[PDB]
Amino acid sequence: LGGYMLGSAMSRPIIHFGSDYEDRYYRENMHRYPNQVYYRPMDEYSNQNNFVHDCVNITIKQHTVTTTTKGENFTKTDVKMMERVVEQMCITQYERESQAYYQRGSS
């Protein structure tokens, strides 16, 4: 956080971990799971891999600090699903910035 941007809630991505046990666990904890991510402007060699990668670590590292002190509790299992759910959320924002970068033209 600091030199990044924040994207408001959109839609909690659907992830598949082990089986129905974990599936229903996360699905029932979506309300306690963050739906916002932190994305940064596109740099040299515009790629979705680097965009989402850097977005995942910051998003989880950010919520675990404030959200866990705002009225939540992210444990080992919480960060696990968060990693997968945030990764998808980062891709969504990737297209959001890619639409403005592609329309920006050659500047």
UniProtKB/Swiss-Prot annotation:
Changing residue 3 to V: Protective factor against Kuru; protective factor against prion disease; confers protection against classical Creutzfeldt-Jakob disease (CJD) and Kuru in the heterozygous state but can be infected with variant CJD prions resulting from exposure to bovine spongiform encephalopathy prions; confers complete resistance to all prion strains when homozygous; acts as a 'dominant negative' inhibitor of prion conversion; is not only itself resistant to conformational conversion, but also inhibits conversion of wild-type proteins. It is found in: Cell membrane; Golgi apparatus. A lipid is attached at residue 106 (GPI-anchor amidated serine). Glycans are attached at residues 57, 73. Disulfide bonds join 55-90. The glycosylation pattern (the amount of mono-, di- and non-glycosylated forms or glycoforms) seems to differ in normal and CJD prion. Its primary physiological function is unclear. May play a role in neuronal development and synaptic plasticity. May be required for neuronal myelin sheath maintenance. May promote myelin homeostasis through acting as an agonist for ADGRG6 receptor. May play a role in iron uptake and iron homeostasis. Soluble oligomers are toxic to cultured neuroblastoma cells and induce apoptosis (in vitro). Association with GPC1 (via its heparan sulfate chains) targets PRNP to lipid rafts. Also provides Cu(2+) or Zn(2+) for the ascorbate-mediated GPC1 deaminase degradation of its heparan sulfate side chains. Belongs to the prion family. Monomer and homodimer. Has a tendency to aggregate into amyloid fibrils containing a cross-beta spine, formed by a steric zipper of superposed beta-strands. Soluble oligomers may represent an intermediate stage on the path to fibril formation. Copper binding may promote oligomerization. Interacts with GRB2, APP, ERI3/PRNPIP and SYN1. Mislocalized cytosolically exposed PrP interacts with MGRN1; this interaction alters MGRN1 subcellular location and causes lysosomal enlargement. Interacts with KIAA1191. Interacts with ADGRG6. This protein is produced by a bicistronic gene which also produces the alternative prion protein/AltPrP (AC F7VJQ1) from an overlapping reading frame. It is linked to PrP is found in high quantity in the brain of humans and animals infected with neurodegenerative diseases known as transmissible spongiform encephalopathies or prion diseases, like: Creutzfeldt-Jakob disease (CJD), fatal familial insomnia (FFI), Gerstmann-Straussler disease (GSD), Huntington disease-like type 1 (HDL1) and kuru in humans; scrapie in sheep and goat; bovine spongiform encephalopathy (BSE) in cattle; transmissible mink encephalopathy (TME); chronic wasting disease (CWD) of mule deer and elk; feline spongiform encephalopathy (FSE) in cats and exotic ungulate encephalopathy (EUE) in nyala and greater kudu. This is Major prion protein. It comes from Homo sapiens (Human). The gene is PRNP.
